[PDB]
């Protein structure tokens, strides 16, 4: 079996990269450990930057998003009995963000790939990467008992945090940067109208709460929760009562509750690996970095890694400029670190930390008061929130 | 002995408040533990906000400052082999800061007070405050062996961090917020021309370094140093060698060195007390709060506490509106916390902290890169640096 670019992982990164590549004439095969249904079961992201929206258009998979996606021009932050609206559009010079679930984006990409007839092998078990520094790397996997080999020119590791690709780079070549937060997010998806037309991030003494949405009749809520929590300990009723206790009274009063369609706990963490490549293997998305959910940057950073990898590969195949691929890590890391800095800042000002001294609590509240009260403070949040510009390369 | 307002402390806070009060017809007496010469020996501050410059004019003690003070429109921040200039004037909408030593300001105030003939008692030993909640509070002190009593309507504690005034408020009425940093600043004053016409704050792997000045022929330099350091362990030559190792090569090459006129180590700390008053006692300046030197806010916050206390007292005496004095703490604390937040931020991004993990070092460098590279980031530094506006009261 032979292709030009082998892609490990059929989550959004792999599918998006594969679609862009296919449309430009660069053959690619995607290998995925799970089944289509398992992948489609992950709820995850809801907020997309303008850059990600443009990439989807370039891949030609934007019909449903243009119809069903909700364009947001602002977002609210509630703390100490007050709600402040950050006008993203005004403060960032006209940019906005789009709410369209990750599940939907993934569904759109999968349908698009099937229609073009590109190769995707699900239940590709025990994927192994070989001869990463040779001129002819290859991938081996198992499909129903038999071990098959796929030959390629390049390999893009789009296999998330627990993927095989990052594990295939000699540990000594990698530099790992990681921070584990002492809390997680308990999320609940419900077929109920959202409490507001814009998102509400809330810093409350009991902990963080976030009011989000998927559509006009589907909501997504989150509440900060200790790492010791087990989802079976949170009945729908306990969740709604908790959510209500963390929101401003006028917001909690008009909240329409309902049975959960999905309920799960996601731990918060920051993780960056440098560089993001080795030989003919290039890491993209969660395989190379994790950002806490607070800033809505994860899927958005995956998009920029992908936009960068695709353009460099195009240059390599179309223009014979294979040497430009060495710049991949340098280009992506500049954006990754600024997004990590923002996600980290959001996380530190919106959440309640264990054993915080009086001074730090006061500084936390003052950070909010300053950034939300100053025109310059507001603009730093807004420009970071809509997403810093992609770099052009070369 | 009787007066209207008793002032404990003849540092800048007490002298400035006393001058403003005298000029408006409100009699006041200042009690100081030390001698004029001891007070004049403290080097301390060099940077003044525009608000402090205007207050000095209002007190009529600005002749020498208008002649000798240096107006700065920018400041540099050096990190990772690069120097970035923050144009304060442009980014803050026209404000600047003035470099005029604290020693000089204090000298100007002392001469001004003597000329007007207002009362100042130096070597006032063992000052004690009494009947703080009565309608007739009083102060007792000792002058050459005999204990004297001073009767007054109000008492302004302008006695710094180690003063008697804050200690006179029942501890249970106070809420203390404090952070101790694991380092201090070793400062050196020299009769040498400064290395630059604007200040240079430097984040270097070896630690923080700051290049300041007092005039065209007098410089003030600082280098971060562990708390275990003793000044006798730092010869002038060791200091210059250390300073040079922390600055960009092109800056270290043109540095004119020379023997020190003063050398001392100041520990870094944050401290705020709430409220800032009790009965007829009002705390101002270092007596109520300490901010690390990094943001040049200490003397500047003392000025705003003083501007606020003076205007409220004027209202009380001239207009019989004694009830407005209850708003003192609320008004001052709003400004104090934002300045504390800024001083804290500056301190955390410019200094090298003990046992910092890889992630935090990278976040530190990224904070700099973001704030110094974004027009909105630059503006948050600049507006905070020149000093946020004073509140108007009532
Ligand atoms: C609570 C939550 C909220 C979030 N909210 C947002 C938000 O609003 N906005 C935003 O920008 N980001 C957000 N994110 C982040 C976003 O979900 C991720 O960054 C995104 O899923 C990254 O996609 P990916 O394709 O790189 O990896 P993944 O989605 O993890 O997909 C990787 C795929 O690789 C497959 N795979 C793994 N191992 C192998 C193997 N060995 N062989 C073959 N295939 C393999 C996996 O099965 C999976 O299909 C959120 C995440 C969470 C958890
Ligand atoms: C290294 C350094 C650099 C700084 N740099 C800057 C800068 O550039 N800009 C800026 O804004 N700030 C800066 N500051 C801060 C600034 O120096 C202080 O905030 C300022 O001195 C506050 O003045 P004050 O009058 O409140 O107190 P002080 O200057 O401490 O004076 C208090 C006075 O009260 C007297 N006193 C004490 N106890 C008694 C008693 N029991 N009875 C009677 N009298 C008593 C003392 O002797 C002293 O004279 C710096 C400080 C340091 C140490
Ligand atoms: N920051 C975030 C905002 C929204 C969501 C979500 O809608 O799922 C997740 C994270
Ligand atoms: N931030 C500071 C800037 C300058 C000085 C000083 O000149 O003494 C002190 C602190």
GROMACS .gro file of N, CA and C in nm, chain A residues 208-288:
model
  243
  208UNK      N    1  -1.561   2.808   3.923
  208UNK     CA    2  -1.592   2.852   3.789
  208UNK      C    3  -1.717   2.786   3.730
  209UNK      N    4  -1.789   2.861   3.648
  209UNK     CA    5  -1.906   2.812   3.577
  209UNK      C    6  -1.905   2.876   3.438
  210UNK      N    7  -1.948   2.802   3.336
  210UNK     CA    8  -1.950   2.854   3.200
  210UNK      C    9  -2.080   2.816   3.132
  211UNK      N   10  -2.149   2.914   3.075
  211UNK     CA   11  -2.275   2.892   3.003
  211UNK      C   12  -2.249   2.904   2.855
  212UNK      N   13  -2.259   2.792   2.785
  212UNK     CA   14  -2.236   2.791   2.643
  212UNK      C   15  -2.356   2.735   2.569
  213UNK      N   16  -2.337   2.706   2.441
  213UNK     CA   17  -2.446   2.659   2.358
  213UNK      C   18  -2.395   2.587   2.235
  214UNK      N   19  -2.486   2.520   2.166
  214UNK     CA   20  -2.454   2.449   2.043
  214UNK      C   21  -2.547   2.501   1.933
  215UNK      N   22  -2.670   2.538   1.971
  215UNK     CA   23  -2.767   2.591   1.876
  215UNK      C   24  -2.874   2.662   1.956
  216UNK      N   25  -2.983   2.699   1.892
  216UNK     CA   26  -3.090   2.769   1.961
  216UNK      C   27  -3.168   2.679   2.057
  217UNK      N   28  -3.152   2.548   2.043
  217UNK     CA   29  -3.223   2.455   2.130
  217UNK      C   30  -3.132   2.354   2.198
  218UNK      N   31  -3.002   2.380   2.195
  218UNK     CA   32  -2.907   2.290   2.260
  218UNK      C   33  -2.801   2.368   2.338
  219UNK      N   34  -2.785   2.334   2.465
  219UNK     CA   35  -2.692   2.401   2.552
  219UNK      C   36  -2.578   2.316   2.604
  220UNK      N   37  -2.471   2.382   2.645
  220UNK     CA   38  -2.354   2.316   2.700
  220UNK      C   39  -2.311   2.400   2.819
  221UNK      N   40  -2.311   2.341   2.938
  221UNK     CA   41  -2.273   2.410   3.062
  221UNK      C   42  -2.155   2.339   3.128
  222UNK      N   43  -2.073   2.413   3.203
  222UNK     CA   44  -1.959   2.353   3.271
  222UNK      C   45  -1.946   2.413   3.408
  223UNK      N   46  -1.895   2.334   3.502
  223UNK     CA   47  -1.870   2.384   3.635
  223UNK      C   48  -1.739   2.324   3.680
  224UNK      N   49  -1.657   2.406   3.745
  224UNK     CA   50  -1.528   2.361   3.796
  224UNK      C   51  -1.557   2.256   3.902
  225UNK      N   52  -1.472   2.156   3.909
  225UNK     CA   53  -1.495   2.049   4.002
  225UNK      C   54  -1.357   1.993   4.043
  226UNK      N   55  -1.343   1.948   4.170
  226UNK     CA   56  -1.217   1.891   4.223
  226UNK      C   57  -1.178   1.769   4.140
  227UNK      N   58  -1.050   1.733   4.142
  227UNK     CA   59  -1.005   1.617   4.064
  227UNK      C   60  -1.056   1.482   4.119
  228UNK      N   61  -1.094   1.483   4.246
  228UNK     CA   62  -1.144   1.365   4.313
  228UNK      C   63  -1.286   1.325   4.271
  229UNK      N   64  -1.355   1.412   4.197
  229UNK     CA   65  -1.491   1.384   4.157
  229UNK      C   66  -1.507   1.276   4.051
  230UNK      N   67  -1.616   1.202   4.065
  230UNK     CA   68  -1.651   1.095   3.974
  230UNK      C   69  -1.783   1.140   3.915
  231UNK      N   70  -1.799   1.126   3.784
  231UNK     CA   71  -1.923   1.168   3.720
  231UNK      C   72  -2.050   1.101   3.775
  232UNK      N   73  -2.042   0.975   3.817
  232UNK     CA   74  -2.160   0.906   3.871
  232UNK      C   75  -2.210   0.969   4.001
  233UNK      N   76  -2.129   1.059   4.059
  233UNK     CA   77  -2.167   1.129   4.181
  233UNK      C   78  -2.244   1.258   4.150
  234UNK      N   79  -2.262   1.289   4.022
  234UNK     CA   80  -2.333   1.410   3.985
  234UNK      C   81  -2.460   1.386   3.904
  235UNK      N   82  -2.572   1.380   3.973
  235UNK     CA   83  -2.699   1.361   3.907
  235UNK      C   84  -2.728   1.491   3.833
  236UNK      N   85  -2.819   1.485   3.737
  236UNK     CA   86  -2.854   1.604   3.662
  236UNK      C   87  -2.899   1.712   3.759
  237UNK      N   88  -2.984   1.673   3.855
  237UNK     CA   89  -3.035   1.770   3.950
  237UNK      C   90  -2.928   1.839   4.036
  238UNK      N   91  -2.827   1.763   4.077
  238UNK     CA   92  -2.718   1.819   4.156
  238UNK      C   93  -2.641   1.920   4.070
  239UNK      N   94  -2.623   1.888   3.942
  239UNK     CA   95  -2.552   1.977   3.851
  239UNK      C   96  -2.624   2.110   3.833
  240UNK      N   97  -2.754   2.106   3.806
  240UNK     CA   98  -2.831   2.229   3.785
  240UNK      C   99  -2.833   2.317   3.910
  241UNK      N  100  -2.845   2.255   4.026
  241UNK     CA  101  -2.846   2.327   4.153
  241UNK      C  102  -2.712   2.396   4.176
  242UNK      N  103  -2.605   2.326   4.141
  242UNK     CA  104  -2.470   2.378   4.154
  242UNK      C  105  -2.448   2.492   4.055
  243UNK      N  106  -2.486   2.470   3.930
  243UNK     CA  107  -2.471   2.571   3.826
  243UNK      C  108  -2.542   2.700   3.870
  244UNK      N  109  -2.666   2.685   3.916
  244UNK     CA  110  -2.746   2.799   3.959
  244UNK      C  111  -2.686   2.873   4.074
  245UNK      N  112  -2.618   2.802   4.163
  245UNK     CA  113  -2.558   2.867   4.279
  245UNK      C  114  -2.437   2.952   4.240
  246UNK      N  115  -2.378   2.925   4.123
  246UNK     CA  116  -2.261   2.999   4.077
  246UNK      C  117  -2.288   3.114   3.980
  247UNK      N  118  -2.411   3.127   3.936
  247UNK     CA  119  -2.446   3.233   3.843
  247UNK      C  120  -2.518   3.350   3.911
  248UNK      N  121  -2.517   3.468   3.846
  248UNK     CA  122  -2.584   3.588   3.896
  248UNK      C  123  -2.733   3.551   3.908
  249UNK      N  124  -2.803   3.604   4.008
  249UNK     CA  125  -2.944   3.570   4.028
  249UNK      C  126  -3.034   3.589   3.906
  250UNK      N  127  -3.021   3.702   3.836
  250UNK     CA  128  -3.106   3.727   3.719
  250UNK      C  129  -3.083   3.630   3.604
  251UNK      N  130  -2.966   3.565   3.601
  251UNK     CA  131  -2.933   3.467   3.498
  251UNK      C  132  -2.985   3.330   3.542
  252UNK      N  133  -2.966   3.296   3.669
  252UNK     CA  134  -3.014   3.168   3.722
  252UNK      C  135  -3.167   3.154   3.722
  253UNK      N  136  -3.238   3.266   3.730
  253UNK     CA  137  -3.385   3.269   3.730
  253UNK      C  138  -3.449   3.227   3.597
  254UNK      N  139  -3.386   3.266   3.485
  254UNK     CA  140  -3.438   3.235   3.352
  254UNK      C  141  -3.376   3.112   3.286
  255UNK      N  142  -3.302   3.034   3.364
  255UNK     CA  143  -3.235   2.914   3.315
  255UNK      C  144  -3.336   2.801   3.298
  256UNK      N  145  -3.344   2.747   3.176
  256UNK     CA  146  -3.432   2.634   3.146
  256UNK      C  147  -3.343   2.512   3.163
  257UNK      N  148  -3.381   2.422   3.253
  257UNK     CA  149  -3.304   2.301   3.281
  257UNK      C  150  -3.363   2.183   3.206
  258UNK      N  151  -3.294   2.071   3.207
  258UNK     CA  152  -3.346   1.954   3.138
  258UNK      C  153  -3.253   1.835   3.153
  259UNK      N  154  -3.297   1.715   3.114
  259UNK     CA  155  -3.210   1.597   3.127
  259UNK      C  156  -3.086   1.605   3.039
  260UNK      N  157  -2.975   1.554   3.090
  260UNK     CA  158  -2.850   1.557   3.016
  260UNK      C  159  -2.845   1.454   2.905
  261UNK      N  160  -2.788   1.495   2.792
  261UNK     CA  161  -2.767   1.407   2.677
  261UNK      C  162  -2.624   1.351   2.691
  262UNK      N  163  -2.538   1.425   2.761
  262UNK     CA  164  -2.399   1.384   2.780
  262UNK      C  165  -2.349   1.454   2.902
  263UNK      N  166  -2.269   1.382   2.980
  263UNK     CA  167  -2.215   1.436   3.102
  263UNK      C  168  -2.076   1.373   3.117
  264UNK      N  169  -1.972   1.455   3.138
  264UNK     CA  170  -1.833   1.408   3.154
  264UNK      C  171  -1.743   1.509   3.223
  265UNK      N  172  -1.631   1.461   3.277
  265UNK     CA  173  -1.534   1.546   3.345
  265UNK      C  174  -1.403   1.548   3.267
  266UNK      N  175  -1.355   1.668   3.236
  266UNK     CA  176  -1.230   1.684   3.163
  266UNK      C  177  -1.129   1.754   3.254
  267UNK      N  178  -1.013   1.693   3.278
  267UNK     CA  179  -0.911   1.755   3.363
  267UNK      C  180  -0.842   1.868   3.287
  268UNK      N  181  -0.794   1.969   3.358
  268UNK     CA  182  -0.728   2.083   3.293
  268UNK      C  183  -0.576   2.064   3.294
  269UNK      N  184  -0.510   2.097   3.183
  269UNK     CA  185  -0.366   2.081   3.172
  269UNK      C  186  -0.307   2.164   3.059
  270UNK      N  187  -0.179   2.195   3.071
  270UNK     CA  188  -0.104   2.270   2.970
  270UNK      C  189   0.010   2.179   2.935
  271UNK      N  190   0.039   2.168   2.806
  271UNK     CA  191   0.146   2.081   2.762
  271UNK      C  192   0.196   2.126   2.626
  272UNK      N  193   0.326   2.145   2.613
  272UNK     CA  194   0.386   2.184   2.487
  272UNK      C  195   0.513   2.104   2.471
  273UNK      N  196   0.539   2.057   2.350
  273UNK     CA  197   0.659   1.982   2.318
  273UNK      C  198   0.734   2.061   2.213
  274UNK      N  199   0.867   2.067   2.224
  274UNK     CA  200   0.950   2.140   2.128
  274UNK      C  201   1.067   2.048   2.093
  275UNK      N  202   1.094   2.025   1.963
  275UNK     CA  203   1.022   2.077   1.846
  275UNK      C  204   0.897   1.993   1.823
  276UNK      N  205   0.829   2.016   1.712
  276UNK     CA  206   0.706   1.943   1.680
  276UNK      C  207   0.728   1.851   1.561
  277UNK      N  208   0.851   1.806   1.540
  277UNK     CA  209   0.877   1.722   1.427
  277UNK      C  210   1.005   1.645   1.447
  278UNK      N  211   1.020   1.540   1.369
  278UNK     CA  212   1.138   1.456   1.374
  278UNK      C  213   1.147   1.384   1.239
  279UNK      N  214   1.253   1.412   1.164
  279UNK     CA  215   1.268   1.347   1.035
  279UNK      C  216   1.149   1.379   0.947
  280UNK      N  217   1.080   1.276   0.901
  280UNK     CA  218   0.965   1.293   0.814
  280UNK      C  219   0.830   1.283   0.884
  281UNK      N  220   0.835   1.297   1.017
  281UNK     CA  221   0.717   1.295   1.103
  281UNK      C  222   0.693   1.438   1.154
  282UNK      N  223   0.570   1.486   1.139
  282UNK     CA  224   0.530   1.620   1.185
  282UNK      C  225   0.409   1.604   1.276
  283UNK      N  226   0.418   1.662   1.396
  283UNK     CA  227   0.309   1.655   1.494
  283UNK      C  228   0.216   1.774   1.474
  284UNK      N  229   0.085   1.751   1.489
  284UNK     CA  230  -0.013   1.858   1.475
  284UNK      C  231  -0.125   1.842   1.577
  285UNK      N  232  -0.179   1.953   1.626
  285UNK     CA  233  -0.288   1.946   1.721
  285UNK      C  234  -0.252   1.890   1.857
  286UNK      N  235  -0.348   1.822   1.920
  286UNK     CA  236  -0.330   1.766   2.054
  286UNK      C  237  -0.212   1.672   2.069
  287UNK      N  238  -0.159   1.624   1.958
  287UNK     CA  239  -0.044   1.535   1.963
  287UNK      C  240   0.080   1.614   2.005
  288UNK      N  241   0.079   1.744   1.978
  288UNK     CA  242   0.193   1.827   2.011
  288UNK      C  243   0.171   1.921   2.129
   0.00000   0.00000   0.00000
